[PDB]
Amino acid sequence: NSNICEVCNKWGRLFCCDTCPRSFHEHCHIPSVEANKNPWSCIFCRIKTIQERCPESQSGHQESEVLMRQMLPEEQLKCEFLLLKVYCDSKSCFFASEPYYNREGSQGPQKPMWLNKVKTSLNEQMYTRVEGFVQDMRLIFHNHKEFYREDKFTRLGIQVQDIFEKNFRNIFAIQETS
C-alpha cells in the first residue's frame, strides 16, 4: 500500500485499501473510514465496482437527467467521490472552511458555501437529488468569482471549478460534446 494519504499526500495514521494500493487518513476518505470491515474497500474501488457491474453506466448522459436523479445509494456514493476528487487538489484548501468577507469595494455573497459544509450535508443525507449537491458545489466557486472581481485571486475559483466539472463529467458519464 501507499505510505501517503491519497487525498492530502501526507503521511500519518493511515487506513489501507484491501483491494487497491491507496491509503487514507480517517477524515480524508469520504465517507470517513469505517470502524470495522475486514476487508475494507475504498471509494475508488467501490466506484469501479459500480461501473463493472453495469458497463452501460458509462454510456453518455445528459446533465439535465443526471441532476434530477434521486440520491439513492449509488448517486450518494458518486457525489461523495466527486467531493473527494475536489479535496484531492491542494487548491481546495481555499474553499474548505467557512469564509468571511471584508474587502473594500465588495459585498459578501447572500449564501456562503464551502466544502466542509457540503461534506456535512452529504453525511447528514440533506440532499434528495444530485442537483442539490451540484448547485452547492457550483455556488462555492460562483461566490468566489463574484467577490474577488478583478483580483487575480479569482483564478483560484476557476481552477478548482475546472477540477470539479471535469470530475463531474467523468463520474456521471456526461455525453461528450464540443
What is the contact surface with Zn ion in residues (CB under 5 A)? Answer: 5, 7-8, 17, 19-20, 22, 25, 28, 42, 44-45, 54
Identity of the residue, 139 or 173, whose beta carbon is nearer to Zn ion in the bound complex? 173
Identity of the residue, 8 or 139, whose beta carbon is nearer to Zn ion in the bound complex? 8
Least spacing, CB of residue 164 vs Zn ion, in Å: 19
Identity of the residue, 20 or 67, whose beta carbon is nearer to Zn ion in the bound complex? 20
Residue with cell 447572500: 110
Identity of the residue, 40 or 148, whose beta carbon is nearer to Zn ion in the bound complex? 40
How far is it, in rounded angstroms, from Cα 76 to Cα 163? Answer: 19
Give the bridge partners for 24, in sequence order: 15
Q: Which residues 6+ apart lie within 8 Å of 178 measured at CB?
A: none
Q: Are 160 and 118 in contact (CB under 8 A)?
A: no
Least spacing, CB of residue 12 vs Zn ion, in Å: 7
Half-sphere exposure of 62 (CA within 13 A, CB side): 3
Nearest alpha-carbon partner for 142 in 165, 125, 176: 165
Identity of the residue, 24 or 127, whose beta carbon is nearer to Zn ion in the bound complex? 24
Least spacing, CB of residue 22 vs Zn ion, in Å: 5
Least spacing, CB of residue 103 vs Zn ion, in Å: 31
Residue 133 grid coordinates: 449537491
Least spacing, CB of residue 93 vs Zn ion, in Å: 12
